[PDB]
């Protein structure tokens, strides 16, 4: 879509809305794109705000090389212009930043000396503007996560700034706070001697005091007048903005100066006490780019706007709740919608394996670890992941597995372990137990009935972290079992009807992703025994309508399931047979 | 006609799946055929279940529930790596079981639940772990051995059920024989209590298992005690401490109820 | 070591006293802004007894100074909240905790 | 070479070692899956016999010695300096091939992985170096998945080194898989490993990606686009009020969102700058918006507590009056008629400004824009003009979505391209020079 | 598919033949479906022979002979219920001197060059039990002192006569009909 251009694309989810398909496109044998899709197609657009991403190895202009640090040389990252001096060379200003930020202290305090180095919080990095690179076109300093300004002409005057002045009751301004996303200086103005010197490249050094928030710059061994004071807990990314006037533009030098700690000691918490400069592989140069996609939300907040009268003005009303699940990247201080991982492969894989690790650390009844994990992944996140239809299949399976492992697996395993033993107390209701419901020798619905055999006891503990007791670390964390049961039945009812239509878009992208996690959760609940009476009737009706009808539509058993789903159905039928055997054993004990 | 029965429905579904598709998953094939065989072997389910069926009086329901909870804790400890807290939990569970009344009043339920076997696999795992470096977690091994000896003393049939596993206890008898204050709490002591004062079990006792004990006694008579010389005891050529253990086991093997089993 | 800031006013007359349970909804956050606990996530009002050392101290004095129906933010320094050792697996060592606590009912 | 003998006198069979290492990797290559069951089983039998013979001849320790001699030199350039350039280009390849050969020798062999436990401690000590990280991690994964004794001997220091590998080398799912193998092996859970991994990884919340539920926040703004520029005909003082008819403090598990104030546009475009169209971001979550939630002044996603009489979060029946002064950049608020002791000053005035409210679900608010668009409950400060006076003579004032996409049918949704600049908002008279 | 599953399980290399209840049950079902077990006329005898041939064909047309050879080979000379069921199935499919099954077994053995099969046969013969005077006298004394045996079989003497007879009947059925090929191959 061009400037001031408006368009509409119809994917033909409703064939009736297509206005020219019948006259041209239906008879020819073509199909609407959303011919038999149950839900709307996710819509992706070009992102407006530029973001910082690692420089591709195949970038036509920018080349970044990592010079390892020797005994006498600091580790260096060198940014070079590949296509300088040739046609298609890009002359505009590039914005460069490093991947990891320096995080200032939460509360501000109010021959190098080893003790000073070990007690200090001051960190340093320096930049060598190479000879022949025009220094007035190069800026060095720090930026925050808010920097998304892409301008062909960048000047320090047009940086985004705000000054919050908190005053007392009488009006005196007792405190003034200056806030900005960019804290950088120019090399052209930094050069007091000026011109080009090849004894050493123009070396602006950035000094950050994490305990005071003071940003001071040193150019060629003399401190520049420009200084910045930042807010507590500010995350500052080393950044260099430069316009290429030579094949060699600038170089990040991760060294250290007298009594000032290296950048790695602040970036990495493992190297917090290591004065030796380091450039771990995680650190890498990132650049601002427009080449990224943005995902349109499937559903937006419903807002009603209207003017009641001249007196009342305009009314804005939003009364229906809507939530999205946000994935926060810790290193970049960036958060994205978890549904955007459908097109981001590396984050999807890493998060699926993180979910696997979450399931593994609490495996086989580690109730304390499960309680700890309840903080990281909670009931609302679990329920939203379970119910959401646009969740990627891998994340869907992982979240079903995590929900089963944290809350349900311990008691499910306990009842499975006690399943093959029949300790039947001999009571009045036990005597009342009979093989058949009535004189007609017709089997009752499996599971439904009066069972008196001794069963394991269900106990759960509320995962509260303000409490200082330790008795809660036995027993699995509590979950809203009634809500889980109702939602599982509702989701199975939806899945049976929708999958039979054989839609192009199942939940998770495949029938296996749609059914295996859902049927596994249903089987876990059945094994635990939450399903009682009417729930058992409905679920058996779903499994096979004809057989389990009380004394059309096809069930799960005859809907052409994949092999993994068939294995789960076999497990369900095995459990039903086990229930019938238990009923038989109890009836024999009753007769005895 | 409609299936109208879970058995018929499952049989038809399994055969129908198998004849529609060549199943690529061996686990799926085995699950389907196990389920079909269960449908066609309804008698076998009762044959399997009835020996594991027990009826308890209404007065002991909660007490049996507590015993079952303790046994479930012990059974769940089978699937975790051995450690300090696992040792503490196992010792507490065994103590609760031994102090519980059903363990005494209903020895048949105890055998049906396979509690002695579970204690056996726990002890097997701990004995296998760190076999060369003396024995790790000696306290819970001693506790399990005491529990097992008491299980032998509870009932005669429990003694035979424990006797059925005497073979293993003999090759792992040489565990805590040298260490004092562990006497009466070793696999050799468990094996001895497995045949203590039982003519039928003494007669069923074989020749090779006696030969194994004689071999261990010969080894103790030939070579000294590495643990004792490491702790600094003077190096005499032979091992009286373990020799006496093997001798008293042979004493229990050959002498029963005041008479001598000549065989 | 605890300060109280009011989000929503209370009655200002009823305060927790000895032997009286406090029913609250809380949302705990660290200074970095990451949530770690919320009874609102659990749909489950939290009940504890004043003076029975049932919760962390900072929470205890925060609830004590709060009034009925009041919504207040509790900033609990490490000395009164989990100390230097922290909570294994949840709270990092030497962490200051921010709580959004609403005193529902005193009973 | 280590003892410093002259390079030509020392013979270093680099090419033969590399070619033999390729031959050995092919010789220990695992069978492919597409082969039939019988052929697969026979080839597994042959591989098992080969591994058993090699381990009985002690070929693992030989590989370990070669690896140690190669790690004596710290880098490819260092090795090239000590021995020569020809060994220099091949140092990395020989290390990779040796690690692959070790992995092939120990893979699937329980006895070999059990005998490699003694050397596992030496193996992890070199995990940090980049020239051997992948190979060492693969060997460690094979030993962990095969031999239970590996999990028995792995200690807290080894677990912490493996965890710090994630921090130093970045996100790698193979480290997570190795950690899962450390937790569960052959259906047996190691409680010590589980507890150590949990307590050393989870509390940081700096390596693993974090998840949370955020309420959607939508922004509504009037039609007016007011700014300041030199030699231009627009008033530099403006005033409007927002009064809340109803608000629900907790419609969900998360607190409701309700922020009011002014927002700016990047340049002369009608587009709210510095923020994303959809998400949980509202007024004051960027350096282009300036908000007030009843207790905090919001700007740049950072909040500062501002005092006010009977200070509280925005409740039902609360009047918020917003003041904007473009002569000297100043945004001030007055709650229920009494002043709020704080203001935004010295912000960017290059772009156009407009009133804006950001909200989650559970609100009921009303704009009092002055004139016939609502009557101010409180008298405007002197010199301020009601916001209804900024409407263009031909246009009609209306409150609409700040962002261009809203809730509607997908096939009826109006996809919008870039808009044209609104430089017409600032009428700067420019007669020709004479 | 069931026979192929069992054959693949047998052909997988493991240090010991694991006890599989599915195999132990379905092998018995298969053997019974084959054998299905006063004067009878010639027509009755011929019909019985034809029915037995058809019932044996239903299995050896689907890999039963190769399955029972593979299970014995993977047994590695260990006596147990697995080989007890496998030998019974082999007897069931070989009853009547089935030349087709004999040829199939010989062809499979020659093609695969299976030494483990014959090694396992030698091991099973070595592990076969005989009369035990010591056990007999011990159980006689146990009965004399009055301790009644819980099991009336008293199978300590002649441990597995059914297994021994089944093994040697299988090895005889391999050579019935004057099968010179097996007579020389054994």
Residue numbers in the entry:
A (entry chain A): 1207 to 1316, 1414 to 1854, 1889 to 1929
B (entry chain A): 2053 to 2315
C (entry chain E): 2 to 108
D (entry chain A): 436 to 869
E (entry chain A): 3666 to 3702, 3710 to 3858
Can you list sentences taken from the study reporting this PDB entry?
Ryanodine receptor type 2 (RyR2), an intracellular Ca2+ release channel located on the sarcoplasmic reticulum (SR) of cardiomyocytes, is essential for cardiac muscle excitation-contraction coupling. Structurally, RyR2 is a 2.3 MDa homotetramer consisting of two functional regions: a massive cytoplasmic region, also known as the cytoplasmic shell, which comprises several regulatory domains (NTDs, NSol, SPRYs, RYs, JSol, and BSol domains) and the stabilizing subunit calstabin-2, and an activation core and pore region, which comprises the Ca2+ binding site and the transmembrane domains. Dysregulation of Ca2+ handling, characterized by aberrant SR Ca2+ leak, is a pivotal pathophysiological mechanism in a spectrum of cardiac disorders, including heart failure (HF), atrial fibrillation, catecholaminergic polymorphic ventricular tachycardia (CPVT), and other arrhythmogenic disorders.
RyR2-S2808D channels were recombinantly expressed in HEK-293 cells and isolated as previously reported. We determined the cryo-EM structures of the RyR2-S2808D channels under conditions that resemble diastole in the heart when cardiomyocytes are at rest (concentration of free cytosolic Ca2+ below 150 nM and ATP in the mM range). Analysis of the root mean squared deviation (RMSD) normalized projection showed that the architecture of the RyR2-S2808D channel was between the closed and the pathological primed states, in a “subprimed” state (RMSD = 0.11). The subprimed state would lower the activation barrier of the channel facilitating SR Ca2+ leak.
